[PDB]
Design a protein around this ligand. Structure first.
Ligand SMILES: COc1cc(Cc2cnc(N)nc2N)cc(OC)c1OC
Length: 157
């Protein structure tokens, strides 16, 4: 199964100055729950943002730089390489990988950040004519998670 995994805001912002503009440990816990024991595929910029591979899952970096290597990370150089990865594979970003994969994936796990933040990188537009909401769950708020957010699982219509 090939899935997108993304957190974006009401204007599809997915980053500002190479970071998430919101701080939502609850979203990071969502990511842990979905992807632990599976595979994340991400662009080099997203990898350099997380700094180190996320534990307890396969971390795959897609980059055109054949000189790129990191202990604990598998590196690929083509989109085609993704289709040969075993198991459940989550496309983890960033913008250009999302743009390349949105028409190709089976489903999407989206955290909608229910606010409008500063942004300089964006998830591609999508329509609920192409996507069906399989589940929608409001995120819980606490002192460390202060922005309303909604967890969606979308499948093709
Ligand atoms: C684990 O940390 C980060 C994760 C992400 C990607 C990401 C984060 N959340 C969700 N739901 N999907 C994603 N693809 C992006 C980040 O920065 C841009 C991160 O830095 C904290």
């Amino acid at each position: 199964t090939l899935s997108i995994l993304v957190a974006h805001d009401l204007q599809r912002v997915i980053g500002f100055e190479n970071q998430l503009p919101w701080h939502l440990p609850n979203d990071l816990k969502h990511v842990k729950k979905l992807s632990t024991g599976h595979t994340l595929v991400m662009g080099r910029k997203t990898f350099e943002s997380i700094g180190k591979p996320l534990p307890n899952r396969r971390n795959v970096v897609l980059t055109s730089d054949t000189s790129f290597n990191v202990e604990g990370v598998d590196v690929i150089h083509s989109i085609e390489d993704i289709y040969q990865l075993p198991g459940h594979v989550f496309i983890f970003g960033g913008q250009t990988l999302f743009e390349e994969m949105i028409d190709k994936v089976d489903d999407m796990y989206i955290t909608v950040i229910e606010g409008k933040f500063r942004g300089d990188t964006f998830f591609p537009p999508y329509t609920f004519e192409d996507w069906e909401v399989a589940s929608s769950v409001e995120g819980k708020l606490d002192e460390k998670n202060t922005i309303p957010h909604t967890f969606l699982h979308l499948i093709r219509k």
